[PDB]
Each structure stands twice: as structure tokens, then as C-alpha cells.
């Protein structure tokens, strides 16, 4: 009432420049001081007053005005700078004058350094408050690798270097980082090249209206890409005329549909009373009565609640400190400043801007409104509070495919199998063939003493039929694959089929070649043991060859992949086929020598069978038909041995050729070698 000893606040309100906040944060401060002076509850003995200067957001002028504030008549108790560069200057200087600095409009991360600015506070949150929100979405939608294109302003660099540490605590990875000055052609082209899905674009509006024209040109938008921008652009920043870009307004709307934006909630979205008995709607209505222009064309309108709440936080701190006297403050005592600092630190109240609490670094904690551009108009899809970690979703995120896209395209490794129909058909033919083989072997062994089938070497044809049966039995495991066997039992199946087919062919063609060979060598100038020992030595050398193969270079499973094909069950899925073989390190070199050895024996057999065509001998009387058996076996083997290699891929045709050659060789061999030798014994004796 009477004492009313005034307490002075020095303030710098930018009425022009990069951010004309003082055009609306200064009226909001004035009004606020009234509510602190008209209420007898807070600071009744004292009265808060305001000396202010126009800073224009130029530190060069703020330096002169800081001289005017600190070196003129009334002693200030606190400083209230606006934008961020002035705030950096003033907050570094005021350490020497023992002053508190309480900014209302600075968003730089750099100001959260408690070593440079040991007495700085602000009701405007740091720009890094967006980062806890973004991560919360990346964990909600499961994305785990991210691209970050930015403009090279220091605020954006500090924001992204905080985002890196914020994600690497959660396991997410930033795979790509690009920085540009004014023209983003190269960064966005490298993003299209590297195939980045989730993008975080940190740049101003004029840079954005160029980035997104180059995104429409490069087609980096659409159904599989999502853009995370900043929320404080104008709500029609993509529809205004701009000659620096080349994409009509009908485009540049299509490149932006569906991008998420985070902003700070400056005003309270409820309709409750603050610590000044006033709601957000009527605070806005009351401030609009002061401004001499419309709030659409006045600057700093979206920040006036922060100036109001800074005035109120200061008032409540002064009301909590004061039996400390504020009328005897001078720039050399550091105790009264410590009192005001400890009362300002532990600040918690409800203002027009919401709940007002400061960090350990003096930055205010606030809410983040998350919204999404849907059809050319932003729609609020949620809120998030980082302090108690509460995300309030509204269930309005209209995605293009129903579900949000993924961080990268998945590849499904599909195995290929031969069609089971053809396998089972050839297997049943081979089973009837092997039962015919054992029938013919039993027939030959029954009549051992007829002396007409003793003039034909009987044991040699028995060994031929046994080898034929072993080849027909080895057709079976040749068709088996990963459809039935599995990984652990694979090498046993391949090794078994190798040994069975090798021994079958060796024994059959050895028993047929020793007969042709000895008929020729007796014709040109007879004994059972020599005849048996020759085929025994032949199959023994082949057995030793296959054993050295096994021992020096075992056969093992090997997968070979194909070119990627679009499988189309989903619009965005990609699958790569795989074929499973049994192979050694150098199977082709090792198999080639064996195939050549057998081919040379087969051609030698053909020549010997044609040379000894009409010769007649009584100790072996069936060479005339053994020759035509050899001709067919050799023709089939020397033509389906290379085809099994040229068609190593297309496993169905490889199996078809190989197994049809085996079964037809077996059938014609046993027929032309045993049908006459039984027909002459059921029609002539």
C-alpha cells in the first residue's frame, strides 16, 4: 500500500528480426505484472516493475542494451531475454553480475549447458524435447533403422546429436546422415540410392518447400516412406506460391501426405483454471484485446503463454524467498541470488501454459502434440508427456496400407523341391524293376545245371543283374531332398546314393565288359578264375577310387541361390529361391575324371562288341546279345552323363533324365539278356 518498494526486471523484447516475439510477448508480460500487483496475496510489500528494450534479435544491439540495463539508475533483480542468440550472450555475461536470467523464448539445446550458464532458466523448452517423442513412436511402430537428413544450422546439429544418444540407449540405429546448406538435391538423391525408409527431416520452412519438391521429383514419397518433420511451420506451407521450386501446387501436396509432426504444446488443451484464475480461452481473448493487429499477423503470439508463466514463476520465487530483503540487492553479493536460485529451481505450479517444472539444467518440461497431414489438413493423432512417460493416442493415424510401413524389406529364403508326383512315379517304376531283377536272378540261379545256361557264364549274368538292382535301388535316395530328409541326415543319404550307384554301374558294366573282352581276347588268341578275377580287380579299383574320394574330400550339403523374384502374395515382399545339393569342394573336377574313365571303358566296350560280333564260342554263347546290351547302355550313359551336369539347375529335369536313363537301361539290359535265355527253356525244353 504505502511502502510499495518497487523491484525491477530488465527485459529484452525482439520487436523485429528473425523472430519478432516481442510483438505479443511484451503485452502478455505487462498484463501478467498487473495480476501480480493487483493480487495482495503475492508480494504485497513489493511491486514488480519492468524496464525493457528492443533487441531485434541482434546480439550487437543487445550488448549495448545490456550495458544500459546493468549501468543505469535502478538495480535489476533478474534479466528476461527473448530469442536464443541474445539469451546465449546475456546468460554467459550475467555470471559476473550475480544475476538470474529467465528467458521466455529460447529453444537452443546449447543453453542447457550448466557449466557455461550456471544461473539460466527458461519456460520455453529445449528443441531436443521432440526427441523423446520421436523415439516413443519408433518403439510403438517397431522401426529400428532410421535416416536423418538435416540443414546445417547449429540448432539442428545439436538436436540430432542428442537424438543419436537418445536412440542408441534404446537399440535403434541411425543408418544415414546428410547435411545441406540451401539445395538438398545431393542429400535426397543419396537417400533414394541408399533405400532409407524412415526419415527425420530437420529444416526450416523455406528449405522444406524445396526438399519436398525434390522428393516429389525423385519419387521418395508414397506408400513405403514416412517423413518426420517439425510442427511449427504454417499450416499451409506446402500450398503457397514460391518461384524457387518447380512443382505445381497440385503436386507438393502429394509428396507430403501422411507425414508425422511433433510440436510443443504452448497453451493448455483443457479448460481449467490456472494459478491466476483464468482459462486458456479467455487468456487468448484478453490478449487479443491488447494487440493492435490481428493475432494471425502478429509475431510471437504462440509464445505469449510462456512469457506470462515466466512472470508468474518469477513472482512465486520472489514470494517464496522473502526474511531475505530484495531492496538491498547489489551485484556483488551472491547469497540473495542463491536464495532466488534455490526457490526458482524447486518450482511447480499450474499456469496458462500447463504444468511448469524445470530440469536440473533449467529447461522446462512440457507436452508434445503429435499430428499427421491427412488430405491437406493436419489432424491431431496424439499427445505425449516425457516426464511420467504417458502417451495418449487418439486412434486417428490413417495409413495408406492400414498398417504403417516397415524399416526395411524382408527376404524369405524359399527352398525349391522337385515335384513329388514325378518322383513317386519313377520310384514305383524302379520298384517293379528291381522285383523283376530279383525274379530273373532267381530264375538263373535255379537252373544252374541245365548246361545250356552253363555254356553262358552264369555268375557273370548274376552279377550283372545284382548291379542292375543296386542301380535301381539307388534311384530312390537320388530323389530325396530337404522335403523329407532334413539337414542332419542329408550327407548320409547323398553318400549312400553315391556308393550304391557307383557299385551298381561298376558291377553291371564290369560283368558285361569282362565277357566281351575275354571273347575278343580268346578269338584273337576260357578259364573261370581269370574271368572272375578280372572283374574283381576292376570293381576293386573303382571301390578304391570312391573310397579315396570320400576320404580326401567328403561330400557335404551346399546351397545355391537364384535371382530374386517378386512373389506377389504381398505388394512389398521379396523372396530368394534356394537349391540344395550334395557336393565336395571341387566335385566337378573329381566327377569329370570318373565320368571320363567310365566313358572310355564304355567306348572300348562298344568297339570290342562290334569287332567280336560274328565270332562264335561255346564257353560263352550269348555275346551276340550282350553286345546289343552294351550298345544301349553306353548310348544312354554317354548322353545322360553330360545332361545331368548341364542341367544342374532345374532339378526336376535333371532327376527326370538321370532316373529315366537308369530305369530304361535296367529294363532293356535285363530284357535283352534274360528273355531269350528263358524263352528257349519254356518252348524247347
Amino acid at each position: 500500500h504505502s511502502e510499495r518498494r518497487a523491484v525491477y526486471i530488465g527485459a529484452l523484447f525482439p520487436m523485429s528480426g528473425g523472430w519478432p516475439g516481442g510483438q505479443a510477448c511484451q503485452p502478455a508480460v505487462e498484463m501478467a505484472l498487473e495480476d501480480v500487483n493487483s493480487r495482495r496475496d503475492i508480494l504485497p510489500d513489493y511491486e514488480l516493475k519492468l524496464i525493457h528494450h528492443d533487441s531485434k534479435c541482434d546480439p550487437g544491439q543487445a550488448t549495448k542494451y545490456l550495458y544500459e540495463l546493468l549501468y543505469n539508475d535502478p538495480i535489476k533483480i533478474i534479466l528476461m531475454p527473448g530469442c536464443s542468440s541474445v539469451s546465449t550472450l546475456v546468460a554467459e555475461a550475467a555470471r559476473m553480475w550475480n544475476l538470474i536470467v529467465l528467458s521466455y523464448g529460447s529453444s537452443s539445446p546449447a543453453l542447457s549447458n550448466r557449466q557455461r550458464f550456471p544461473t539460466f532458466f527458461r519456460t520455453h523448452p529445449s528443441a531436443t524435447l521432440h526427441n523423446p517423442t520421436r523415439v516413443k513412436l519408433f518403439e510403438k511402430w517397431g522401426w529400428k533403422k532410421i535416416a536423418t537428413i538435416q540443414q546445417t544450422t547449429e540448432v539442428f546439429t545439436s538436436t540430432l546429436d542428442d537424438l543419436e544418444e537418445r536412440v542408441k540407449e534404446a537399440g535403434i540405429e541411425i543408418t544415414f546422415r546428410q547435411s545441406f546448406f540451401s539445395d538438398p538435391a545431393v542429400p535426397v538423391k543419396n537417400l533414394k540410392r541408399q533405400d532409407a525408409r524412415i526419415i527425420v527431416g530437420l529444416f526450416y520452412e523455406t528449405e522444406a518447400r524445396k526438399v519436398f519438391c525434390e522428393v516429389y521429383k525423385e519419387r521418395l514419397f508414397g506408400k513405403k516412406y514416412v517423413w518426420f518433420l517439425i510442427g511449427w511451420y504454417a499450416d499451409n506451407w506446402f500450398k503457397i506460391y514460391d518461384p524457387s521450386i518447380n512443382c505445381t501446387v497440385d503436386e507438393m501436396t502429394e509428396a507430403v501426405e501422411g507425414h508425422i509432426t511433433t510440436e510443443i504444446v504452448m497453451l493448455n488443451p483443457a479448460n481449467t483454471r490456472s494459478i491466476s484464475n483464468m482459462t486458456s480461452q479467455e487468456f487468448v481473448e484478453k490478449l487479443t484485446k491488447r494487440l493492435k493487429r490481428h493475432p494471425e499477423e502478429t509475431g510471437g503470439f504462440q509464445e505469449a503463454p510462456l512469457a506470462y508463466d515466466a512472470i508468474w514463476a518469477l513472482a512465486l520465487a520472489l514470494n517464496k524467498t522473502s526474511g531475505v530483503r530484495l531492496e538491498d540487492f547489489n551485484y556483488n553479493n551472491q547469497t540473495i541470488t542463491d536464495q532466488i536460485y534455490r526457490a526458482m529451481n524447486s518450482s511447480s505450479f499450474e499456469g496458462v501454459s500447463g504444468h511448469v517444472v524445470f530440469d536440473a539444467s533449467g529447461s522446462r518440461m512440457a507436452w508434445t502434440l503429435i499430428e499427421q497431414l491427412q488430405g491437406g489438413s493436419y489432424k491431431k493423432i496424439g499427445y505425449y508427456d516425457s516426464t511420467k512417460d504417458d502417451l495418449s493416442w487418439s486412434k486417428t493415424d490413417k495409413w495408406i496400407g492400414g498398417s504403417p510401413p516397415a524399416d526395411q524389406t524382408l527376404v524369405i529364403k524359399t527352398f525349391r523341391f522337385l515335384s513329388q508326383k514325378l518322383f513317386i512315379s519313377v520310384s514305383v517304376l524302379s520298384s517293379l524293376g528291381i522285383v523283376l531283377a530279383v525274379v530273373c536272378l532267381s530264375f538263373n540261379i535255379y537252373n544252374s545245371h541245365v548246361r545250356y545256361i552253363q555254356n553262358s557264364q552264369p555268375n557273370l549274368n548274376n552279377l550283372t543283374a545284382v548291379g542292375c538292382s543296386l542301380a535301381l535301388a539307388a534311384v530312390f535316395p537320388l530323389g530325396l531332398d530337404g522335403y523329407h530328409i532334413g539337414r542332419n541326415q542329408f550327407p548320409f543319404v547323398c553318400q549312400a546314393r553315391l556308393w550304391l550307384l557307383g557299385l551298381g554301374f561298376s558291377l553291371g558294366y564290369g560283368s558285361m565288359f569282362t565277357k566281351i573282352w575275354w571273347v575278343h581276347t580268346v578269338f584273337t588268341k576260357l578259364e573261370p578264375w581269370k574271368l572272375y578275377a578280372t572283374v574283381g580287380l576292376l570293381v576293386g579299383m573303382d571301390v578304391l577310387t570312391l573310397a579315396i574320394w570320400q576320404i580326401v574330400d567328403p561330400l557335404h550339403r551346399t546351397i545355391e541361390t537364384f535371382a530374386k523374384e517378386e512373389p506377389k502374395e504381398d505388394i512389398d515382399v521379396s523372396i530368394l529361391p534356394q537349391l540344395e545339393h550334395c557336393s565336395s569342394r571341387k566335385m566337378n573336377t573329381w566327377l569329370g575324371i570318373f565320368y571320363g574313365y567310365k566313358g572310355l571303358l564304355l567306348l572300348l566296350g562298344i568297339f570290342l562288341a562290334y569287332e567280336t560280333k560274328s565270332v562264335s564260342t561255346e564257353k560263352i554263347n550269348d555275346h551276340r546279345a550282350v553286345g546289343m546290351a552294351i550298345y544301349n547302355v553306353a548310348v544312354l550313359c554317354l548322353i545322360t552323363a553330360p545332361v545331368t551336369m548341364i542341367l544342374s539347375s532345374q532339378q526336376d529335369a535333371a532327376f527326370a533324365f538321370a532316373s529315366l536313363a537308369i530305369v530304361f537301361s535296367s529294363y532293356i539290359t535285363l530284357v535283352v539278356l534274360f528273355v531269350p535265355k528263358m524263352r528257349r527253356l519254356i518252348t524247347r525244353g
Binding site: 546480439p59 550487437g60 549495448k64 550472450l89 555475461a93 584273337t524 567306348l603 568297339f607
Partner: protein, 670 residues
């Protein structure tokens, strides 16, 4: 005497590191002040420098500037500021009090922006004033491929960006850029990887020892690499604790670039003295304090102040920081200063000093001056005697490679050609012997046309070797490309006749044992081979191809490598043609060998040469398969493979003709 007051903001304390600058330049300021006082340049007035202590802290510096504005006399200018943050804070605000600042130790490029700092001047060259000097040193030694190894701090980033900006428009290109942060030895995969010889470094002292240690660990030092780094490191900076014995070895001959403290000339300066007299009297005043490399710039700064105040007086006092026109007058009076001081010609271009840049080079214990650049005249000069290179000539920007076609040894070719011509005249002598004794009954016991075809095939196999042997450096290019076809025509025709005749004889002997047209078979064999060869020429003619080896070996060492390349005659898919013809020949050869073994002990009076033709088939078989295997296996060195193929062909044909014709001469003549 009415004073003219000047504000001198410097760190003068004992604990601040840069205080040594503010304590080493004060002798020079005292010299300049006392000499302006004795000379009476400013006759009615007198110059008074008030010294204030900005401890290189933004807060203390701004408080000192404020306490000078309030509790101090009427200042007309500001003099000094050695730390960049405080100097920036004050330089941006000068325009509010109309004060003009002249610095002498603030070298940061930032202050060159004359939109933020239109009232700032400095007598010391900027940090990015060394870039034109580097450009002149490069255009002076023809270096055009340069690799930059910067560091990711602000100052080095500005120097690097101005380097990028100044090499524009010139024929010097930057191949690669490295921007290491704290451990510089990851540039190995990039600097060496692109193989750059002229490295431009911009990094601070503590990283220079790590760079010159990683360069020794990688061997980026020696007669072939050049390092161009900043030269403002303290003397003996390489004492940071590869060993010192190897760190010095990797540092030998790096070129440091810095500003020149004192001009080397001997013209009488505006002070009436020469730079050497000033240096001597300064070191006489500099009794106990440390010598600071900035003293000449502070001397020239005080002289610029005095001349500017004089020139502003003669164009006209109560100054109170509110007078705009007087500050504008002093600004115009300082924009046209032009005189000679102890650091060279003092003249400003957009507030920046146009000074001289010193080039120095590390020589075996310490850095010695090897040249100087002059920016106002833009001329580089180099002291030829002082500069030295570890190589006999200055390093080159880019290593290049020379072809050096892989040749075959000419004397070995000559020796093998002499042996083959000896064998060819021997074969022609055997043919003449056979045609002479044609009607002798013993020669009639062997089909003579078959032996004459054998001898014709042997002489053609002896005549193909002259074409097959050629390296390709003895003949022209396109003539060579149309000669690899004749070599194979003659080789396959000679082989087909020389083998078909003895094959005909062995098959006929075998067929007549078990129980004219004998030459038709070789006619059909030559017909099928001619068809194969004409199809070969028709669908994919033998082309000319060339292959390259490691490019590594340098025997002479001209700093340029050699690219050993080898010639060949191939086509698109010649592997299938080689396989086809080799199989067609090898299966038939084996078949003939089998017929020769089955028909070994036979005796036929009509064809008496049955056994020795079989031995010839055996030797032809063995030698031909061995020759083909070695020819396909040892394509690496053409000398050894040519030698082996020549020896095997000559041996095969000579043994064949010996076994065929020699006994039918020894048993016939005697």
C-alpha cells in the same frame, strides 16, 4: 597536452595461457608510443593507451569493456583482443558506441564477415590467408592431385572450406577429403587407398604426431610423398610422448605454412628504422619476458592508429560515443592506410591485412625458411638452396603405369628356329630318299603314298612352328591377327595327314590280320577338319585379345609403374572349340593306340612296317597329350611355354620320321 585515449583490451594476467601474448607485445607498444611522443607526430595532442585486462573469458572480457566505457576516459578506438570469442563479442557491438577496433592477434576467419563486423580491422593475416600461398606453391611445382586431411573443429573447417573455394577455377583438383575426429590413423583406407602424393593437412599440434606416426606405420613417407601442414606449432613440438627415431624419419621434409613475423627487407620503414634495428631494440627491451611472435604486428598497429588519428584530424575534441560522423570519418581514414612497417607493407582490403606468408621445411632437426609469399603482389619466391627433397626431383602428383609388352627371348626363338629348319631339311632329305628308291622291292613292301603323306605332315608340323613362335612384337598388329589362323590351319593339316597315314596303315594291318582305298580315309579326315576350320573362321574368327598382370613390379624405379600385358589370339567362347578339337583328336589317337597294341606281333609281307608304326603311334600319343597339357597349363610365361611346345613338337616329329624311315634305309643300303 589534450590526450587521445585508446582502449587496449588484452589478457595481461599471469595464469592465463595467452597472457604471454599480452606481456610480449607491450615492449613493442611502449617503443611505438615513446617514439610517437618524441617525434611529435600528433603535435598538439598525445596518444594515451589505457590497458584493460580481458582474461580471455567472455564474461570477464565484457565486464572489462563495460567498466572501460563507464569508468574510463573518452576512448576513440579499441586496440587488441587476442581470443576469438571475446573479440567477436566486442567486434559485433562496436557499431553501437561508434568505436573502431584494430586487432593484431585475432586470426580467426569468422571476423572477416563485414556484415557483422563492419568496424573491425586487423594487422595480422587471417587463418585462411595461407590458401593462396598453397595455391602458388602448387602451381609452382605442377602438383595437381592433392588430398586434404582436415579435422572436425570449427577453425580447421573454415580453412578447409576456403581451400575448397579458392581452388575453384584453377586446374588443381582435390581427389579426396578426410575429416578425422580424435584418432587420425583410419585415413589409411582412404588416403593411401586413393594413392595421393601431395597431402594438405589442417590439424592441431597433438594430432600431428599421431598423423606422422600412422604415416610411418603405413609408409606414407619418403621420397614420394609431400606433407603441407600448418607451421604455427611451437618449436620442438614433436616431443610428444613408433619411436622418436621413426617419428623424425616420417617427418623429414614436411612443409609448414604460417605468417611471417618480420619482413626480411631492409627498406627504411615509416618509423625511420629497418626491421633488423627494430628487432634488436625490441630484444633489448624484452629483457626477461617471453618473445611473442606478434610484436611486429602490434608495432604496426600502433602506427596505423597514429596515422589514422592524424588523417582524421586534418579532415576536421568532445567524443562521447554518440557522434556518428566522427566514427564514420575514422572508418574512412583507416580504410586507405598504406605504408611500410616492420612486418611489410601495411594495407587493408575489406578490413583484412594483405601480408606475407612464410614457407618453412623440416630439415633433419628443425624447421628452416624456404620461401615467402607476397599477397599484395601475389608472388611466391622460393630460396632454391634452402629447399631440399629426399628424391633427386620434386615429387609428382600422380604415379602412372607403362605397358611394357611381355616379350619372348629372341635368341631362344632363333635357336629353336635353327633346330626346326635342320629338322625340315632332314625330312625333305628322307622324302627325296623315298622317292629315289621308289621301284626297289623293299620300299614296295610298304605303301609309299602313306609314307610320303607322313613326311609331308612332318614338314608342315615343322613349318607351323615359325608362325606359332612369334611374340607379336616382331610383326604388325592386324597382320598378326590374320596370322593366328594360318598357324592353326597348317598345324591341324600337318597333324591330320601325318597321323591319318599311320592310322590308316595300322587299321588296315589289323583288319587284314583277323581275316587305292587306303588313302581315301585320310582324304575324308582332311575333309572333316577343313569343314570344321571353315566353320571356325566363319562364325567366330580368331580375334586378338590382351591380358594384364599385377601391375606391381618396378625394376628401374622411375616412380612410374609398369603394366605387364600379354598378347593372345582368342574368340568369344574358344573354350568349346578347343575342347571339341582336342576331344576329336584324343579319342581317335587313343583308338589308334589300341589298334596298334592289339596288332603288335603281326607280320604282313604287303605292309612290313607294322611294329615300328605302332611305336610311332605310341610316341606321338604321349608327346601330343603332354604338349597340349603343358600348353594349356603354363600360359603365364610365353618363353617357357613356347620352348616346351617347340621341343615337344620337334621331338615328336623327329622320332616319328626316325622310326618310320631310318631302318628302311639302314637295312637297305647295307
Amino acid at each position: 597536452s589534450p590526450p587521445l585515449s585508446i582502449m587496449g583490451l588484452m589478457p595481461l594476467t599471469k595464469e592465463v595461457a595467452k597472457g604471454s601474448i599480452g606481456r610480449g607485445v607491450l615492449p613493442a607498444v611502449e617503443l611505438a608510443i615513446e617514439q610517437i611522443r618524441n617525434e611529435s607526430l600528433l603535435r598538439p595532442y598525445f596518444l594515451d593507451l589505457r590497458l584493460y585486462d580481458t582474461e580471455c573469458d567472455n564474461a570477464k572480457g565484457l565486464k572489462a569493456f563495460y567498466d572501460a566505457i563507464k569508468y574510463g576516459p573518452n576512448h576513440l578506438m579499441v586496440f587488441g583482443g587476442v581470443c576469438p570469442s571475446v573479440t567477436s563479442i566486442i567486434a559485433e557491438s562496436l557499431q553501437g558506441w561508434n568505436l573502431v577496433q584494430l586487432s593484431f592477434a585475432a586470426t580467426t576467419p569468422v571476423l572477416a564477415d563485414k556484415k557483422k563486423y563492419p568496424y573491425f580491422f586487423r594487422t595480422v593475416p587471417s587463418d585462411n590467408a595461407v590458401n593462396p600461398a598453397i595455391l602458388k606453391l602448387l602451381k609452382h611445382y605442377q602438383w595437381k592431385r592433392v588430398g586434404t586431411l582436415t579435422q572436425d573443429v570449427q577453425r580447421f573447417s573454415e580453412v578447409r572450406n576456403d581451400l575448397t573455394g579458392v581452388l575453384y577455377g584453377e586446374d588443381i583438383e582435390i581427389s579426396d577429403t578426410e575429416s578425422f575426429s580424435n584418432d587420425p590413423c583410419t585415413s589409411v583406407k582412404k588416403l593411401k587407398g586413393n594413392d595421393v602424393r601431395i597431402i594438405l593437412g589442417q590439424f592441431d599440434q597433438n594430432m600431428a604426431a599421431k598423423v606422422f606416426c600412422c604415416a610411418y606405420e603405413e609408409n606414407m613417407y619418403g621420397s614420394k610423398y609431400q606433407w603441407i601442414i600448418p607451421g604455427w606449432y611451437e618449436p620442438s613440438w614433436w616431443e610428444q610422448v613408433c619411436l622418436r627415431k621413426n617419428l623424425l624419419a616420417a617427418m623429414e621434409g614436411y612443409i609448414g605454412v604460417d605468417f611471417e613475423p618480420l619482413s626480411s627487407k631492409q627498406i627504411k620503414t615509416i618509423s625511420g628504422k629497418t626491421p633488423q634495428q627494430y628487432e634488436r631494440e625490441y630484444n633489448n627491451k624484452r629483457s626477461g619476458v617471453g618473445p611473442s611472435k606478434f610484436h611486429g604486428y602490434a608495432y604496426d598497429g600502433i602506427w596505423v592508429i597514429a596515422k589514422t588519428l592524424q588523417r582524421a584530424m586534418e579532415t576536421l575534441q568532445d567524443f562521447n560515443y554518440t557522434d556518428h560522423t566522427l566514427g564514420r570519418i575514422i572508418l574512412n581514414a583507416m580504410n586507405e592506410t598504406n605504408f611500410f612497417g616492420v612486418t611489410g607493407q601495411v594495407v587493408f582490403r575489406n578490413g583484412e591485412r594483405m601480408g606475407t606468408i612464410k614457407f618453412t621445411q623440416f630439415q633433419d632437426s628443425r624447421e628452416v625458411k624456404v620461401g615467402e609469399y607476397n599477397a599484395v603482389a601475389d608472388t611466391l619466391e622460393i630460396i632454391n638452396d634452402t629447399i631440399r627433397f629426399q628424391g633427386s626431383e620434386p615429387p609428382k602428383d600422380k604415379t602412372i603405369i607403362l605397358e611394357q609388352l611381355r616379350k619372348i627371348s629372341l635368341p631362344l626363338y632363333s635357336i629353336l628356329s635353327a633346330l626346326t629348319i635342320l629338322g625340315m631339311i632332314m625330312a625333305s632329305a628322307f622324302l627325296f630318299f623315298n622317292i629315289k628308291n621308289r621301284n626297289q622291292k623293299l620300299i614296295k613292301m610298304s605303301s609309299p603314298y602313306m609314307n610320303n603323306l607322313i613326311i609331308l605332315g612332318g614338314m608342315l608340323s615343322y613349318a607351323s612352328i615359325f608362325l606359332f613362335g612369334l611374340d607379336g612384337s616382331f610383326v604388325s598388329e592386324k597382320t598378326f591377327e590374320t596370322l593366328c589362323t594360318v598357324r592353326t590351319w597348317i598345324l591341324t593339316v600337318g597333324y591330320t595327314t601325318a597321323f591319318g597315314a599311320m592310322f590308316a596303315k595300322t587299321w588296315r594291318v589289323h583288319a587284314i590280320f583277323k581275316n587305292q582305298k587306303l588313302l581315301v580315309i585320310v582324304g575324308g579326315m582332311l575333309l572333316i577338319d577343313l569343314c570344321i576350320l571353315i566353320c571356325w573362321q566363319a562364325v567366330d574368327p580368331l580375334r586378338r585379345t590382351v591380358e594384364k598382370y599385377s601391375m606391381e613390379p618396378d625394376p628401374a624405379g622411375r616412380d612410374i609403374s609398369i603394366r605387364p600385358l600379354l598378347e593372345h589370339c582368342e574368340n568369344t567362347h574358344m573354350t568349346i572349340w578347343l575342347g571339341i578339337v582336342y576331344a576329336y583328336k584324343g579319342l581317335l589317337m587313343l583308338f589308334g593306340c589300341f589298334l596298334a597294341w592289339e596288332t603288335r606281333n603281326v607280320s604282313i609281307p604287303a605292309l612290313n612296317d607294322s611294329k615300328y608304326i605302332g611305336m610311332s603311334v605310341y610316341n606321338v600319343g604321349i608327346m601330343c597329350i603332354i604338349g597340349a597339357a603343358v600348353s594349356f597349363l603354363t600360359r603365364d610365361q610365353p618363353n617357357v611355354q613356347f620352348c616346351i611346345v617347340a621341343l615337344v613338337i620337334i621331338f615328336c616329329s623327329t622320332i616319328t620320321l626316325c622310326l618310320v624311315f631310318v631302318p628302311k634305309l639302314i637295312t637297305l643300303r647295307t
